[PDB]
Amino acid sequence: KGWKFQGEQGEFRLEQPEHNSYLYFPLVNEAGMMSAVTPNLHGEITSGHNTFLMEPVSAESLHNSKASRNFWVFIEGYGAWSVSGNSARQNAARFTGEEERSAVEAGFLWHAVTRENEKAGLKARTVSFVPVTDDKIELMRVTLTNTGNAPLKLTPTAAIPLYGRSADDLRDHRHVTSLLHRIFTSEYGIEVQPALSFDERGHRVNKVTYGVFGAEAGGTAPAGFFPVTEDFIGEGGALDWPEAVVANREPDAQAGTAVEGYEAVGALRFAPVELAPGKSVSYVVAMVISGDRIDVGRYAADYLAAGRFDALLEQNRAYWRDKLDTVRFSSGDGEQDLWMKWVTLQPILRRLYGNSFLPYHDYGRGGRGWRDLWQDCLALMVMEPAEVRHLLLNNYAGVRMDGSNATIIGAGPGEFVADRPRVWMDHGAWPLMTTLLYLHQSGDLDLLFQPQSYFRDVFVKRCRERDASWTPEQGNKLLTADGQIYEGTILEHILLQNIVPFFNVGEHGNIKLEGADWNDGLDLAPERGESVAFTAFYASNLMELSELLLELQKRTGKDSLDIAEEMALLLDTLGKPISYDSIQEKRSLLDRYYDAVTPRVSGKKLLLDIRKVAEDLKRKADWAVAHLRGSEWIQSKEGYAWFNGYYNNDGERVEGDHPDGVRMTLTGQVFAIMGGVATDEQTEKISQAVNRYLKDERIGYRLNSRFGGIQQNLGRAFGFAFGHKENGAMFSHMTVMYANALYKRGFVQEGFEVLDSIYRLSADFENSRIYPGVPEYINERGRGMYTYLTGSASWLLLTQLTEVYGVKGRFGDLRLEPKLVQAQFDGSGEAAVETLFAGRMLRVVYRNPQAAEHGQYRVDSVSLNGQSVDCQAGCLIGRSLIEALPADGVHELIVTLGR
Amino acid sequence: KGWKFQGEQGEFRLEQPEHNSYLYFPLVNEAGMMSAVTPNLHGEITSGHNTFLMEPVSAESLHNSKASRNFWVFIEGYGAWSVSGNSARQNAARFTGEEERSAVEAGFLWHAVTRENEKAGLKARTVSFVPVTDDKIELMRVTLTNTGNAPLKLTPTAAIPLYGRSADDLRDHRHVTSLLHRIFTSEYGIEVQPALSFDERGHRVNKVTYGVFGAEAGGTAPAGFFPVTEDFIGEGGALDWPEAVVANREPDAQAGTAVEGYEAVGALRFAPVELAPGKSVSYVVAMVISGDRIDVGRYAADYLAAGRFDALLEQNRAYWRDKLDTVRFSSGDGEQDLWMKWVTLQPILRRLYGNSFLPYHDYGRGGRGWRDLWQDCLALMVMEPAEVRHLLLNNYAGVRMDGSNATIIGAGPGEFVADRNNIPRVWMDHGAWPLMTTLLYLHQSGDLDLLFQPQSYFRDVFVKRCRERDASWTPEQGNKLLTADGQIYEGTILEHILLQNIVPFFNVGEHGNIKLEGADWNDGLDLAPERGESVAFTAFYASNLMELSELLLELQKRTGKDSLDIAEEMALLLDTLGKPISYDSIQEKRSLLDRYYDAVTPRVSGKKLLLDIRKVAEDLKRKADWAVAHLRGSEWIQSKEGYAWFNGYYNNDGERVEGDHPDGVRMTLTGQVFAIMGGVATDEQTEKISQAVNRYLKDERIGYRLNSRFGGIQQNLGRAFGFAFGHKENGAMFSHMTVMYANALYKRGFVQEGFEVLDSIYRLSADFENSRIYPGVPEYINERGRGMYTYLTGSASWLLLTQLTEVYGVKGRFGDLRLEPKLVQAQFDGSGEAAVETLFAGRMLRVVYRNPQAAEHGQYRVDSVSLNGQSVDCCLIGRSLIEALPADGVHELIVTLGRNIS
Ligand SMILES: O=P(O)(O)O[C@H]1O[C@H](CO)[C@@H](O)[C@H](O)[C@@H]1O
Ligand SMILES: O=P(O)(O)O[C@H]1O[C@H](CO)[C@@H](O)[C@H](O)[C@@H]1O
Ligand SMILES: [Cl-]
Ligand SMILES: [Cl-]
Ligand SMILES: [Cl-]
Ligand SMILES: [Cl-]
């Protein structure tokens, strides 16, 4: 029995939720409170790597640690009882068929745990959410209801175990750092403000304060406190069976008590209460992180006063509804439409958690990587576009003059940090892809001619050597001969990122793997490894760049490109061409370029004919396409055929026939298809090979087939068990990209199969054991792993919107090109998407009254708010017609399909 | 109800032991298995920072984590039951007055947990120990007994949760590293050998293997296994209530199964068994760490075959009995005598754990520090003296030519490691301890030639006591000081000692006392490197210089030695021999030290001067006399209330730390101890110090505090003051310093005062209601009276040494045996005797003091001494008389005490 959606806004319910290991749900705000909550109220609460309110956890902690959030009721005639079932007594009923009835319900963005004590006649409902205010705070409301025939006498105790320091102290100096604790009680609760912090930052004064406060529903303060963990649990006790609750002790402390040197717990004893039959009492608990001592009075008024929890919960619901209403799908698959709303949430979660601080994500420290800078723009372009232009510009400051980039992202806009060395060969590919998407959604072609600096640190020639001339006095920006900061166009940056890899070839003529590509686990072939997979991506990028430049001339009238003089060496088609068949000549020309720009550029720029640069780019792209088709197209003895993706550190071809089974990678196929290196015939054959070697009937499209044992000339990924992480799991991000590539090329039935498999696997709860959303991967047992924060959600959202429903920009104009299959249309012959375009909410409704399959339909007519529209692949609508619409409301655009 | 000793070899029992938080007991061998076991079988098992078999823990884990060692019985008519009480059902009885009867018993070196299920009529007894074999292994034997009227039907399951990787992975990449697990089942159990290790060493291939194996008493293998943790516990389960046990599921795996990518548990299902009334069945479980895949057949034969557990347990008992029989006390306080056997164990534990890998000691990675090199020699001198000479020689290789030393200790004998990237603290006290330890060796052994052995000096990028980085250093020079012609410089051990003590003499702050540098003994006084001063250790260096002077003159008187071979550059520091500087001038002392540093950096000339041993002695005595007068005249302070004592410190603002202050007088114990021990304090000053200590430091509940309360953090002095008052180095009863205080008192003849101090340590430690610890001396007694950081503390070495050499007064003087009892009347037993068995000059002596007149200390003298039934001349016995005794046996030495005349 999996979860079931309730209503039409994505709310779900799961019965007996704690009968599933490892479940958790995210609660977060922009202010920076980051929490996870499990069905028994375990998880974690933090504002950062150094400021955990609750103990840092990984997945095994969710069952193995007793320190959940808790709320206790000492019931007369029964004794101690946890509202979430986390007591030794209640846990002892697991697997005996005597378990209490329980449920989780959740929505955007809140979580509710219910439990029933049939013996005592008591029901509890505990609602958790992070308010969308400017405070780092999580709220909990516990409502107790008497379901029996006679009055119940109850003594309530909230208990939030506190940690209140860096994850660095989890074990290392865990005890020593407890001696630094200072606990302060006041009318509404408990503050912990360690005197000092001891962690990897060193030994420093601390002012950060962690608070647990509470009140009855009417605002009445707690009767008293047990702020010291060892006194709360008692001698030989534990947090799932604490003496203070179990023996119903009188409180240890009242308001104004200070205690030093002990682990703390936010244990708030409320007044005993007599609850009438059928009636309820409620309690609100607040968990707070602040930069200094907390103004507890203000927090009590804002969060604990009567009615504040309920008003703030409504405000949370309206804020999240508003964020997620920017993309809505409506089809014949009602369940998948609602599942997609959870997918739509995920890119926001990734931003707000910094890919960290959820139980599986046990290594992240909340930062951003280079890839995140570009990937975060995908969801924002369709959900919240105002910020994207400034983000893209800032990102290009990270590029070095050798096409590589900074890999540590700083605090400020366009701030990058030099490393106290690894190059990922794919890092140069993603920016053009993201930037092109922006250009097509916005029509803002002038972005390309904005000025920007280049990043500079000790590492030169793509981190192959240290610059001898470097000091602290150079700074973090590339300098000219005359000592000025060099600035080049965004387009110059883009050109550099794509043309440098073209020349950076290995002994088999494909682009070097360097420290890894997209697959972070292919890290053991920096000397001789090659990523054929991303050679296809760079080949495609160069071709798109050529087309872009010619379209810039055709649309803008622009005839020249301002480029650093030294870059002319790499555009050899304009001067003395080299042979692209010669590895030696390509490498030598690249070395000449590196020499010309290290340590400084001249600062002089050449103006080059935009058509002649385009011709140089097309020559590069054509050479690469021909080389991949002629040299890297492989076949097994059985007769399946596909593209080799890799060479290993011994210069050996990775893919093809092998002892113990054929070796194939999904990554080696995706960009060949997406970018056009693969012909239509090759693409059909690749899809057959993928289905034959990679498509598992239990777990879907694997990232790779099985390589037996560790592969120390290729990557650490192969030390993972087969079916997990980057070793042969269904890795959602790559599988979505595969589907995207198929749809792009017109392989719609094949693309549909891929996307539908991701949904079906994710939603098959008996195996996946996850809440609605797309996980990072589906593993060898069919379990969903590393939930919520995966970049796959961005790609899934984008693919559904821009490929499947086919609502996308073309140089700022709106293009409609549906790739919906017949089964996707609802009972009235309709499928619809609501989406933001050119600053307006559109509801694009596709009508298929003849019930034609994809390939048998075309666009017959388009109407916009009840007037007929002109339509210039598919149908194209000028941007001015969208912009002339009113700002408020959803404007209906009806596309009628016929045979 | 605390623990109670049983029998006369130190075994104890504690009833309802899990009614106490944070208790644990150590099990360890020389092979390198290091474990801790709690009353519910929690703790940890490891061979090192990177090779934990069970999950790394700290103190809070002992209650908060469900992952104890466990052994389960599914009892027909009752259900799942843990032999240690660690089940959700059993834990739910805590605080309800319905708890099962339980107990811990332990001895040297083994642990037993007992429990009774009165409802089912079942009793269990689980014995844990680490065999004394060459394997890294812990054994467990569970014995189940039917105490009821009818047959019991039982299904047993052992369950040792596995971790099997570095403590670095505890959370950071915890899940990712589980994907590297490879589990292999075989007839007798489960092996986990991760394919790779990801930790602070990097990403590497792994071969280390972690095993859990088992058998019935008669040798029968397990019926099957549940090797995968999530399958053992079940969906929504936990290790204290696992579905495989609770629902009595059939095993997941048999011998020959391999599973990859999952957290593992050594869950061994045994055959169901019908147990008759009054009868027992037993099971043996083995937990193994090995450098490669385990020869499971050999381990089964060696550890699981019938009778092996019991034979190995007897071998463990005999090995530990043998180690601890080297020192035995016998007095009127029988309980304290047995408590002292546990104290006697502690220095061994500190060596074998490397001060790490017990739950409170949650930061250690198993290494040794500079202090440990010298401190480990104290216990060895009394317990295993054969090793000490070579250890001392090796240790001196760590000294730099500026008197400082290496602070990272390597694998090999006399191996020290440079850290070139990270700027290293200097601890100002590090130069003081070696002479103290070495003098003890010289007096126990009589081996004065040690002083003239050659040894190198340590050399790395850091020069002038880590004040500067040397531009001229390279990797090809090596880690040893070089001469002008590129040869490795060697100087005598004595040269090393001189250097360590004379350099600090000149290294003075603005108030004329020796600089604090990065800290002294108190590691928490780390925030005054620029202007801080340790007056406390200035007294120690003053005393060292005086003892050195006396030592050199005694070398001449005893050996005939007239000269000392010393590096030419060191003559600058012995200024009394050339052009004397004024020791009253800070500027001149600092300038002379800078000249010395310049003369020896980057290299020495290699040339040596021969100096008159009397003239060097005169220079040393002049230094010591100057320091004694300066401390007495400038650092003796008084409160307005009228107490007086020595100021111990200046802070980083150049302010005197101790004395009157708003919110209360500031005083440190450390500032008193070495002044007393070394003679800077006169007898009159010592009496007054003792009064000030009792006034300002002696707490009625927790004993002699390390310092009085300074309100709030002290960012110009040390991070210690961020600790709550009464914990760690902020005002706790810190055993190591308090023992040293007692030692100092006894040394100076303040015997009643000394006795009070030592007795307070024992009484606090053994007052279980507050201390909540097993027998032994903890690192500290805290604000609530709790014993903290058990077993591994250096205080045990000092307590052992003080009891032997000061209290019973059995000690060497240049290799001859000196007997000087400082026992009080209350210490004599019912027959008027107090005795100590101890090794001296390679012979076991039982020194028996008879006080038939029941005289108090101060009212008695030595009336006669007999040795193996013959009269002895003198109180001081020549080493030849001890050496002429037979090698085997304990030789009785009877010292008869009588009253004074007048
Ligand atoms: O965002 P996801 O789904 O978790 O993907 C992660 O792993 C990818 C493959 O190594 C990487 O390419 C990504 O950068 C990321 O680390
Ligand atoms: O051996 P013990 O009793 O645990 O003492 C420890 O703390 C002392 C004071 O900081 C140090 O001086 C010791 O070196 C040691 O780190
Ligand atoms: Cl019950
Ligand atoms: Cl990070
Ligand atoms: Cl019961
Ligand atoms: Cl260490």
Side-chain angles (χ1 to χ4, degrees), chain A residues 194-209:
Chain A
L196 307 171
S197 61
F198 299 173
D199 49 49
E200 288 169 8
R201 301 167 298 175
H203 298 155
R204 298 180 175 175
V205 173
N206 170 72
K207 292 191 181 310
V208 177
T209 303

PDB file of all heavy atoms in Angstrom, chain A residues 194-209:
ATOM      1  N   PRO A 194      26.403  28.114  22.630  1.00  0.00           N
ATOM      2  CA  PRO A 194      27.740  27.728  23.049  1.00  0.00           C
ATOM      3  C   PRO A 194      28.654  28.948  23.223  1.00  0.00           C
ATOM      4  O   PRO A 194      28.505  29.948  22.518  1.00  0.00           O
ATOM      5  CB  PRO A 194      28.208  26.822  21.902  1.00  0.00           C
ATOM      6  CG  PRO A 194      26.936  26.227  21.396  1.00  0.00           C
ATOM      7  CD  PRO A 194      25.978  27.377  21.437  1.00  0.00           C
ATOM      8  N   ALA A 195      29.539  28.889  24.195  1.00  0.00           N
ATOM      9  CA  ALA A 195      30.469  30.007  24.452  1.00  0.00           C
ATOM     10  C   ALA A 195      31.503  30.155  23.321  1.00  0.00           C
ATOM     11  O   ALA A 195      31.887  31.273  22.942  1.00  0.00           O
ATOM     12  CB  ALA A 195      31.189  29.788  25.761  1.00  0.00           C
ATOM     13  N   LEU A 196      31.961  29.006  22.828  1.00  0.00           N
ATOM     14  CA  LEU A 196      32.933  28.907  21.738  1.00  0.00           C
ATOM     15  C   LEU A 196      32.477  27.826  20.765  1.00  0.00           C
ATOM     16  O   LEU A 196      31.632  27.013  21.101  1.00  0.00           O
ATOM     17  CB  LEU A 196      34.333  28.538  22.258  1.00  0.00           C
ATOM     18  CG  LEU A 196      34.975  29.369  23.368  1.00  0.00           C
ATOM     19  CD1 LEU A 196      36.245  28.683  23.868  1.00  0.00           C
ATOM     20  CD2 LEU A 196      35.263  30.794  22.888  1.00  0.00           C
ATOM     21  N   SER A 197      33.032  27.854  19.558  1.00  0.00           N
ATOM     22  CA  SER A 197      32.893  26.776  18.577  1.00  0.00           C
ATOM     23  C   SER A 197      34.273  26.209  18.319  1.00  0.00           C
ATOM     24  O   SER A 197      35.246  26.983  18.180  1.00  0.00           O
ATOM     25  CB  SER A 197      32.290  27.320  17.280  1.00  0.00           C
ATOM     26  OG  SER A 197      33.117  28.299  16.704  1.00  0.00           O
ATOM     27  N   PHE A 198      34.381  24.872  18.340  1.00  0.00           N
ATOM     28  CA  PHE A 198      35.595  24.156  17.931  1.00  0.00           C
ATOM     29  C   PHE A 198      35.202  23.319  16.709  1.00  0.00           C
ATOM     30  O   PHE A 198      34.437  22.373  16.839  1.00  0.00           O
ATOM     31  CB  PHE A 198      36.134  23.164  18.985  1.00  0.00           C
ATOM     32  CG  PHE A 198      36.548  23.761  20.326  1.00  0.00           C
ATOM     33  CD1 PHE A 198      36.906  22.891  21.365  1.00  0.00           C
ATOM     34  CD2 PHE A 198      36.659  25.131  20.559  1.00  0.00           C
ATOM     35  CE1 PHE A 198      37.310  23.366  22.602  1.00  0.00           C
ATOM     36  CE2 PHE A 198      37.073  25.612  21.799  1.00  0.00           C
ATOM     37  CZ  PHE A 198      37.400  24.729  22.820  1.00  0.00           C
ATOM     38  N   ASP A 199      35.718  23.671  15.530  1.00  0.00           N
ATOM     39  CA  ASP A 199      35.415  22.903  14.309  1.00  0.00           C
ATOM     40  C   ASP A 199      36.523  23.142  13.284  1.00  0.00           C
ATOM     41  O   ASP A 199      37.599  23.635  13.641  1.00  0.00           O
ATOM     42  CB  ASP A 199      33.965  23.193  13.821  1.00  0.00           C
ATOM     43  CG  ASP A 199      33.642  24.674  13.744  1.00  0.00           C
ATOM     44  OD1 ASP A 199      34.451  25.417  13.159  1.00  0.00           O
ATOM     45  OD2 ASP A 199      32.553  25.097  14.230  1.00  0.00           O
ATOM     46  N   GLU A 200      36.321  22.786  12.032  1.00  0.00           N
ATOM     47  CA  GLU A 200      37.396  22.984  11.032  1.00  0.00           C
ATOM     48  C   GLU A 200      37.710  24.460  10.756  1.00  0.00           C
ATOM     49  O   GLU A 200      38.753  24.765  10.187  1.00  0.00           O
ATOM     50  CB  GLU A 200      37.081  22.221   9.725  1.00  0.00           C
ATOM     51  CG  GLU A 200      37.226  20.699   9.891  1.00  0.00           C
ATOM     52  CD  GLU A 200      36.688  19.864   8.718  1.00  0.00           C
ATOM     53  OE1 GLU A 200      36.317  20.433   7.658  1.00  0.00           O
ATOM     54  OE2 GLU A 200      36.635  18.618   8.878  1.00  0.00           O
ATOM     55  N   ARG A 201      36.847  25.388  11.189  1.00  0.00           N
ATOM     56  CA  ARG A 201      37.198  26.822  11.091  1.00  0.00           C
ATOM     57  C   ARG A 201      38.215  27.229  12.149  1.00  0.00           C
ATOM     58  O   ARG A 201      38.778  28.311  12.058  1.00  0.00           O
ATOM     59  CB  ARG A 201      35.965  27.702  11.191  1.00  0.00           C
ATOM     60  CG  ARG A 201      34.913  27.437  10.134  1.00  0.00           C
ATOM     61  CD  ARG A 201      33.608  28.122  10.491  1.00  0.00           C
ATOM     62  NE  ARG A 201      33.035  27.635  11.754  1.00  0.00           N
ATOM     63  CZ  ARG A 201      31.942  28.126  12.344  1.00  0.00           C
ATOM     64  NH1 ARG A 201      31.274  29.147  11.819  1.00  0.00           N
ATOM     65  NH2 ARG A 201      31.510  27.580  13.479  1.00  0.00           N
ATOM     66  N   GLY A 202      38.454  26.371  13.144  1.00  0.00           N
ATOM     67  CA  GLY A 202      39.307  26.697  14.269  1.00  0.00           C
ATOM     68  C   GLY A 202      38.474  26.836  15.545  1.00  0.00           C
ATOM     69  O   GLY A 202      37.336  26.334  15.646  1.00  0.00           O
ATOM     70  N   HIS A 203      39.066  27.517  16.514  1.00  0.00           N
ATOM     71  CA  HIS A 203      38.486  27.753  17.814  1.00  0.00           C
ATOM     72  C   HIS A 203      38.103  29.223  17.833  1.00  0.00           C
ATOM     73  O   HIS A 203      38.981  30.090  17.733  1.00  0.00           O
ATOM     74  CB  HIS A 203      39.494  27.465  18.930  1.00  0.00           C
ATOM     75  CG  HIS A 203      39.964  26.044  18.977  1.00  0.00           C
ATOM     76  ND1 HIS A 203      41.171  25.684  19.528  1.00  0.00           N
ATOM     77  CD2 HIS A 203      39.399  24.896  18.544  1.00  0.00           C
ATOM     78  CE1 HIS A 203      41.325  24.375  19.445  1.00  0.00           C
ATOM     79  NE2 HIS A 203      40.264  23.873  18.853  1.00  0.00           N
ATOM     80  N   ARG A 204      36.803  29.507  17.923  1.00  0.00           N
ATOM     81  CA  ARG A 204      36.302  30.876  17.844  1.00  0.00           C
ATOM     82  C   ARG A 204      35.218  31.136  18.861  1.00  0.00           C
ATOM     83  O   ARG A 204      34.583  30.211  19.353  1.00  0.00           O
ATOM     84  CB  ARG A 204      35.723  31.140  16.457  1.00  0.00           C
ATOM     85  CG  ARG A 204      36.710  31.027  15.314  1.00  0.00           C
ATOM     86  CD  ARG A 204      35.951  31.313  14.045  1.00  0.00           C
ATOM     87  NE  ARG A 204      36.795  31.345  12.863  1.00  0.00           N
ATOM     88  CZ  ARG A 204      36.302  31.492  11.633  1.00  0.00           C
ATOM     89  NH1 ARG A 204      34.982  31.650  11.455  1.00  0.00           N
ATOM     90  NH2 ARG A 204      37.121  31.491  10.579  1.00  0.00           N
ATOM     91  N   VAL A 205      34.985  32.408  19.145  1.00  0.00           N
ATOM     92  CA  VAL A 205      33.847  32.831  19.946  1.00  0.00           C
ATOM     93  C   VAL A 205      32.590  32.526  19.141  1.00  0.00           C
ATOM     94  O   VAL A 205      32.581  32.686  17.916  1.00  0.00           O
ATOM     95  CB  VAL A 205      33.932  34.348  20.261  1.00  0.00           C
ATOM     96  CG1 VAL A 205      32.659  34.860  20.946  1.00  0.00           C
ATOM     97  CG2 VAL A 205      35.157  34.625  21.124  1.00  0.00           C
ATOM     98  N   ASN A 206      31.548  32.052  19.823  1.00  0.00           N
ATOM     99  CA  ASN A 206      30.259  31.796  19.189  1.00  0.00           C
ATOM    100  C   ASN A 206      29.162  32.678  19.786  1.00  0.00           C
ATOM    101  O   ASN A 206      29.106  32.853  20.995  1.00  0.00           O
ATOM    102  CB  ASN A 206      29.825  30.352  19.367  1.00  0.00           C
ATOM    103  CG  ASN A 206      28.388  30.140  18.915  1.00  0.00           C
ATOM    104  OD1 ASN A 206      28.109  30.166  17.713  1.00  0.00           O
ATOM    105  ND2 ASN A 206      27.464  29.989  19.867  1.00  0.00           N
ATOM    106  N   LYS A 207      28.293  33.202  18.921  1.00  0.00           N
ATOM    107  CA  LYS A 207      27.052  33.850  19.336  1.00  0.00           C
ATOM    108  C   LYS A 207      25.787  33.174  18.826  1.00  0.00           C
ATOM    109  O   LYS A 207      24.702  33.487  19.301  1.00  0.00           O
ATOM    110  CB  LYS A 207      27.079  35.323  18.922  1.00  0.00           C
ATOM    111  CG  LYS A 207      28.144  36.084  19.729  1.00  0.00           C
ATOM    112  CD  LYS A 207      28.084  37.592  19.601  1.00  0.00           C
ATOM    113  CE  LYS A 207      29.200  38.254  20.422  1.00  0.00           C
ATOM    114  NZ  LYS A 207      29.267  37.767  21.839  1.00  0.00           N
ATOM    115  N   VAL A 208      25.918  32.258  17.877  1.00  0.00           N
ATOM    116  CA  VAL A 208      24.748  31.552  17.314  1.00  0.00           C
ATOM    117  C   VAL A 208      23.982  30.872  18.444  1.00  0.00           C
ATOM    118  O   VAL A 208      24.585  30.224  19.348  1.00  0.00           O
ATOM    119  CB  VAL A 208      25.125  30.515  16.235  1.00  0.00           C
ATOM    120  CG1 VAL A 208      23.897  29.761  15.743  1.00  0.00           C
ATOM    121  CG2 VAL A 208      25.836  31.208  15.056  1.00  0.00           C
ATOM    122  N   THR A 209      22.661  31.043  18.396  1.00  0.00           N
ATOM    123  CA  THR A 209      21.781  30.540  19.418  1.00  0.00           C
ATOM    124  C   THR A 209      20.699  29.663  18.814  1.00  0.00           C
ATOM    125  O   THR A 209      20.116  29.998  17.777  1.00  0.00           O
ATOM    126  CB  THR A 209      21.160  31.719  20.206  1.00  0.00           C
ATOM    127  OG1 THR A 209      22.204  32.520  20.750  1.00  0.00           O
ATOM    128  CG2 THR A 209      20.260  31.226  21.325  1.00  0.00           C
TER     129      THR A 209
END
